[PDB]
Amino acid sequence: SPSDFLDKLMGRTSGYDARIRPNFKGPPVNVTCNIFINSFGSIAETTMDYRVNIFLRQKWNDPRLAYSEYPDDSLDLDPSMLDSIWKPDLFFANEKGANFHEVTTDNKLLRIFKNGNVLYSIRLTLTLSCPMDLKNFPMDVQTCIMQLESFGYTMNDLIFEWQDEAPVQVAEGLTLPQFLLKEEKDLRYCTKHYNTGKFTCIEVRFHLERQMGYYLIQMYIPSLLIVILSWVSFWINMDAAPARVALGITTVLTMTTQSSGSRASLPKVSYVKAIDIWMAVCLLFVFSALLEYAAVNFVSRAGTKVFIDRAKKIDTISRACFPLAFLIFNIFYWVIYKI
Amino acid sequence: SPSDFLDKLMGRTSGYDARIRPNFKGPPVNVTCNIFINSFGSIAETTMDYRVNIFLRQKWNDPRLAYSEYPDDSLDLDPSMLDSIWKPDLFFANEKGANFHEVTTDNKLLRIFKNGNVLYSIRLTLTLSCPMDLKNFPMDVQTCIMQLESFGYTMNDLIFEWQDEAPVQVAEGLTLPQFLLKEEKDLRYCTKHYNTGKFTCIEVRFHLERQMGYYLIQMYIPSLLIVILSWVSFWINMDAAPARVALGITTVLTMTTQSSGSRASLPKVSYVKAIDIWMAVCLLFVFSALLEYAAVNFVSRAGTKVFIDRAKKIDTISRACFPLAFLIFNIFYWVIYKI
Amino acid sequence: SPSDFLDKLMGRTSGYDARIRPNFKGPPVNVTCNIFINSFGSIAETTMDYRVNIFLRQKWNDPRLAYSEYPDDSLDLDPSMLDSIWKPDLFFANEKGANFHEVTTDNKLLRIFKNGNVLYSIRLTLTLSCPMDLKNFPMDVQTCIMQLESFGYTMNDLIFEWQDEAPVQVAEGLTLPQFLLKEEKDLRYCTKHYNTGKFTCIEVRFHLERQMGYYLIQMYIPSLLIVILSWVSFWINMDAAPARVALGITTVLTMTTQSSGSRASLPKVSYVKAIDIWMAVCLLFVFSALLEYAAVNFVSRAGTKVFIDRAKKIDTISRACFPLAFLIFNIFYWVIYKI
Amino acid sequence: SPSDFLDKLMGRTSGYDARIRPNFKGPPVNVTCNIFINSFGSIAETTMDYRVNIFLRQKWNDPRLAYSEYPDDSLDLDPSMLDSIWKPDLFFANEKGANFHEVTTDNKLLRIFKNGNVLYSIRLTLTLSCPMDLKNFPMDVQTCIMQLESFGYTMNDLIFEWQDEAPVQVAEGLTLPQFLLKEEKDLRYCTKHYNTGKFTCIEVRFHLERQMGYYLIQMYIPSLLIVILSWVSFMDAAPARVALGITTVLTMTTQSSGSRASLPKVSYVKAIDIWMAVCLLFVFSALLEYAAVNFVSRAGTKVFIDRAKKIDTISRACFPLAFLIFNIFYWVIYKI
Amino acid sequence: SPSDFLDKLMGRTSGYDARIRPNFKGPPVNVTCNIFINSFGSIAETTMDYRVNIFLRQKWNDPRLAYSEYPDDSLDLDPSMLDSIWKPDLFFANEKGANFHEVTTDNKLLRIFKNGNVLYSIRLTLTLSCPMDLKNFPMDVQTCIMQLESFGYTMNDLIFEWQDEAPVQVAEGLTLPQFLLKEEKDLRYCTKHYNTGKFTCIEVRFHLERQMGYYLIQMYIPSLLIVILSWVSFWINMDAAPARVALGITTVLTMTTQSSGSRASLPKVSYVKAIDIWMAVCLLFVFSALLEYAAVNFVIDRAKKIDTISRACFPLAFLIFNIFYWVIYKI
Ligand SMILES: *[C@@H]1O[C@H](CO)[C@@H](O[C@@H]2O[C@H](CO)[C@@H](O)[C@H](O)[C@H]2NC(C)=O)[C@H](O)[C@H]1NC(C)=O
Ligand SMILES: *[C@@H]1O[C@H](CO)[C@@H](O[C@@H]2O[C@H](CO)[C@@H](O)[C@H](O)[C@H]2NC(C)=O)[C@H](O)[C@H]1NC(C)=O
Ligand SMILES: O=C1C[C@@H]2OCC=C3CN4CC[C@]56c7ccccc7N1[C@H]5[C@H]2[C@H]3C[C@H]46
Ligand SMILES: O=C1C[C@@H]2OCC=C3CN4CC[C@]56c7ccccc7N1[C@H]5[C@H]2[C@H]3C[C@H]46
Ligand SMILES: O=C1C[C@@H]2OCC=C3CN4CC[C@]56c7ccccc7N1[C@H]5[C@H]2[C@H]3C[C@H]46
């Protein structure tokens, strides 16, 4: 008769008040938290948040519930009866959205042990805020957090602490479409301070390194191929007008359809992303490679025997300068965005 | 037994009626309001609103709840019992939608003190309407508000008032993907006047300043360069049929593959914006420079000396007209939108 | 004790029943409606609906709630006990979805007066269906409505009625991203006749004038410019292959990149809009101008005396005919879609 | 006091049990169903479904509720008391999600008549699944159904039935952005069979005919025009002919990628897709045809320029002939 | 009076308690599950999941509910009274989202038979995280699962089992916009092991092959035709500048518009797909054919020497890469 033994511990004749905490008069209650992340995803930068599906598990002691007389060494309080026992008011500080699960039954479990220790396993969906900076897109790396805090109880009455062993665990094979969730999860404190008191808070931080593979092959490399076709105009005489104009116009026009083609499938933000610079710089090196040939024609238009040497002087310079100047920019870009 | 002493104040024996307000006979209830914004964003012109996540603290006095004999200086009421006390009918006048949070327990707190003061903290999500004007895009600024009004109670019975120090606070590091949330939050009244009565209302106003970075680098700067290349056609003589046509075709064609490219990420509004003008004006100047050469070539079609003077005049005029015409427009443009 | 006096009118020893309507014996209950519109937007051609946030104020007489003995001249029933009083089965006929607002408290009010009148104010979100025809887009106009109907009472027992003074009001400074909301609101009856009886229904019509600007500057104008550039090829001699060909190519290619450029931002429907004609006609005029050169070159190919005369005669007509034809089309078009 | 006379028929002393059906021992309960569609829309092939807004109206007989002593010849059960009377366990078999409506009051009605008939009108939003095949897009036509089945009662205890006169009506002036809802709906029976019994089920079938107008004017016709300029290019004019061949290919490839953004998301081939791929050949091969001419006429002699006159003369009456053969095939297949 | 007999079995006087399981003293409760699927859909790499619609059916034995005295040999408990009977604490381990149905009545059914057997059928909407690798688009294949685990009960007290006959059925006619539901579903155990115990879990594997039709006609073939135009320029002599220059420029400019025309109808992932390699390889082959002519014009014996090689090598080198490609992405 375990269900029956419980309402002797919880009921009218027991004298249990779930509105009152354990050790009411004396020291604080110690709640040992740990989670399991079964699902991690929907990281959006427009709403600046991410969704996670977890099992939260709180463990604590309530000496009001300790027993001995009964043979079975642990009792399972029914989900519907959960009001009838005190439990901590842990909430997620940075939660935007939240809900419990109730299919097929309530996804909640409570075990009170013989020594009074309680075990509370509960399954949640959680939308949490993660302020995001795309400055270095697409070589950026984000840091999302998750704060377990007490709502009304202070440090004088309630204290949260992580598990010593694997407090935060993540399901095997979980994938994100754009980031990689890293294996390191930094645990730390966030104990808040207000003029209304001091409140317990424990934190876990996830790290999210973005992937480039797509932008590398479908944007950086093709733009590099076009900037290489900009330089071959230099290795032709001034007399061949059709080639150097057509190439220059192609190179410019092709680079322009590429920089516009990309824009529709990039994160829509107001500030300058690292990718936005690459497109701009690549446009100069295509633009000026056409503007170079215009400067050659303006000097070598007057077909004097002397200045054709000094006009071909521009071309001999550019043959070494444009490849070098590009490589000086290139070496800056990848060193800065892979420091 | 603080929870038991509490329901001596609330219970049938007390004679407390939660439908009735404090000081029901005479003067109005003074309610002191303040908020902490933990999340700000989802600012959308499409639905013309924004989304916030807040704490809302409310402090008033109830002389019925005051007590003395009991030791503990403040009693807190359970979140399941809130309806047994009176509380103010505060609602957000420009709420498109709202709700509470109840994970893991109800995110609500109430403290009633020995003196009779009641402190009521509530966590909330609100979607509030923010009528927006994008006439000056992307050099616009917006002003989203937030009104705390009383529903049923008039000025005679209820008054809402902000805190003196730091009434409306905002969490650290809350980035937005487009706007910048300014430090200045203005505080005023919105007391409503209907035939049915006067109604207390307080208001806090935010200021949002849109960033340009991306549009400056992907639109303005690139377009500026394509318009200058349009002018160099003037500096070539009439004989160079390939060059002058090649530039005119490239410039227009390149200007067009930028305008279509930029449309992708423009805000969804069916009216004219600052950005749209610029793009249309830059089209005219690129189009008409090619149209000018058509008028030059048409005049010198007649190969006599009278007409070659007429056609030589057009270019030499155009060399110092287009750059003046542009500058005069450019001066207007940037002066108007950065007044 | 105004709370206590109410439940003397409603409670056990009163004999009042909420299920029964006022004047149950004979004549119908005249309900007086009026709304205030705080929010208006989310107009979609995909879901073919719109979203409004409103107050709704119903007013009727219940002689059963008449009193005098009690000092105060009006009582307010609590939002929780609205079930204990009769109120009209008013529902919105074209509602797709709707909700009450209950933050921070239930956003409802109900006064019962000394003479037995009622005043029921209620805040509501409504998604209403609005069939929309985009045949003339973007020079179209839509007329969304809003019907207040009784669910189960006929005109014999229940009649709805608008107010005489400002029965429908819209908040100051609301804005829509695509449409303009006109100040005129047509009021009328929608009384429904079924085989089960005749039911009360009252309707308010809003009219929406779609905004043009963006499509004018970003699509109509550029398309016009590209048509003008098609005509400049008539002002070069038949000889110049590079120019006359390259113009025709640019114009046709450029024109096409815009029609598809616009597609991504147009309201996605399967039928022909007015803008879709424009782009298609503009395509003909650009295509046929290139086609005209092909005929000219086709004729004068056999370069004798008679052929080059008849070939040159085409271009001379084309300089007049094409702009004339376009102007005739253009006058018809804009006169038809702005009759 | 009609309210009070009702709870005389329902209350403790009446011996009414809402959990037990009418005609409990004997014959099957006959329920006549009919719907009024106020909204029909949100038809998506991504989630593969559509969204309706309807008035369901169920009529059955309950001899336990028949009366006579009361003057009023029909009694209205309040929506709050709906638990207190037996009513059918109707459910929409192909519903992905539904809900009720409750603004301002509960959007429900019940009427029990003097003779025992019950009349239960209710208001719903349904999201019904509609499998959708886009092989012939945009010349396709879809069929979306709606099944009203009994959850737990079998053919022996419960049978569903459409009204004889106009059981499924649709509201005046309802527009869809892509489809046209056809006037003729069909009615039939979906009566299900399992090991656990035979369950009544009635069904209505809507037909949805997609519109082409837009795709005709801004896609099909243009592609026909560029295919014409592939034929006008039909020796010496090297800058012109090759430019006409090149332009067609450029202007075609911009039209192909131009549409892709607007088209529906499906990984299989559509009719629209074939057209563009076919029209890409007829343009691509026109330029490819002149590369055979320029390869043969490159050797400037008597026999080479005569052989290079044979190619352009055939293509003036072969490409138009070949296209027209394919064209007639295409349109006759996608409009039988 | 079957409704009045039930609350004799369940009610106060019986001493039945739904908080306690059948065979509480000793051996496990054997539940036998099975599902009908009326909707597999909303597969989404962005959220990394699909939303399914099902009937679930659980059958077990409860000897506290056995009877014989009553004539009718099976009783139907009302959906409203489902609290007052024990039933398994089944949950889907890989649910992100799920819900019951309430229209028009509660879509649930419970029969208790003469021999204490309970038969519980319930209608549900789920959403099940399906981690998808997309590295071989659009020749990829994806194995979505669905786990039915016991929340609180171990293997000592509760065991799930699929039906022996047609445990997982799928409704006729269903279609997907991008994939196929492969006929063969797998079944297996997932039984979880923890430090708190060993929990019963049964699972079904749906396989889904993605379709290539759209990308074949609108991408792979048009990319091939452009690469064929890259080879015709070789056959032209070194003299013809406009012809060979116009080809390369057309070939490049055409290949750029297709490769950007695809971007719109590709899935939202940051990593390299197989489609991307093909687009990037078909750039090189166009790009280099133009770059070859630059070496020919930058160099009459050696200038005509390069053209004769690239008529054979480029169609071959392509064919060599191509063979690897389709063999690696169709092993
Ligand atoms: C419900 O419908 C069935 C079928 O129409 C009815 O059963 C018939 O009853 C008539 C007389 O009422 C007989 O003549 C037929 O032979 C019956 N046919 C069948 C197939 O049963 C039934 O009576 C109807 N009404 C109820 C149950 O009240
Ligand atoms: C439920 O399932 C298992 C396997 O069918 C049964 O387990 C057997 O239980 C009996 C009686 O306690 C033991 O003697 C056997 O050794 C068990 N065999 C096993 C585990 O392989 C169980 O009895 C079944 N039915 C019940 C408990 O009603
Ligand atoms: O009076 C307050 C306002 C302040 O609001 C910001 C959020 C806070 C987080 N928790 C939520 C409830 C609160 C609290 C607890 C006990 C008495 C007063 C009280 N609050 C908030 C407070 C902080 C700290 C604490
Ligand atoms: O009679 C009214 C209608 C009017 O509706 C718009 C909104 C208003 C804001 N609050 C909400 C309830 C209301 C009010 C209070 C007491 C008696 C009548 C009454 N109302 C609304 C009124 C205003 C003012 C007030
Ligand atoms: O019998 C009916 C069905 C019919 O269905 C379409 C909608 C209607 C709108 N209201 C809702 C309830 C209804 C009504 C009132 C009283 C008795 C029967 C009854 N109904 C519906 C009816 C119409 C009219 C009315």
Ligand SMILES: O=C1C[C@@H]2OCC=C3CN4CC[C@]56c7ccccc7N1[C@H]5[C@H]2[C@H]3C[C@H]46
């Ligand atoms: O045992 C079952 C499983 C089967 O599942 C598919 C759907 C069905 C539709 N309704 C829902 C409940 C059901 C039923 C009724 C009475 C006893 C058992 C039972 N069910 C399901 C059944 C079919 C038929 C019926």
Ligand SMILES: O=C1C[C@@H]2OCC=C3CN4CC[C@]56c7ccccc7N1[C@H]5[C@H]2[C@H]3C[C@H]46
């Ligand atoms: O203590 C725990 C935490 C752990 O959480 C991950 C999920 C699990 C699946 N079910 C859910 C409840 C749980 C369980 C049952 C009985 C005592 C403790 C307990 N739990 C979770 C546990 C595993 C196993 C089991």
Ligand SMILES: *[C@@H]1O[C@H](CO)[C@@H](O)[C@H](O)[C@H]1NC(C)=O
């Ligand atoms: C709980 O909290 C602290 C930290 O370990 C400690 O002082 C105290 O003894 C702990 N144990 C209790 C209250 O039982």
Ligand SMILES: *[C@@H]1O[C@H](CO)[C@@H](O)[C@H](O)[C@H]1NC(C)=O
């Ligand atoms: C509340 O404020 C008003 C005005 O500030 C004042 O008249 C009143 O006395 C104050 N205090 C109360 C009503 O307790």
Ligand SMILES: *[C@@H]1O[C@H](CO)[C@@H](O)[C@H](O)[C@H]1NC(C)=O
């Ligand atoms: C309601 O209006 C009707 C129509 O004018 C009138 O006949 C009736 O007397 C009015 N008042 C009632 C029924 O109380």
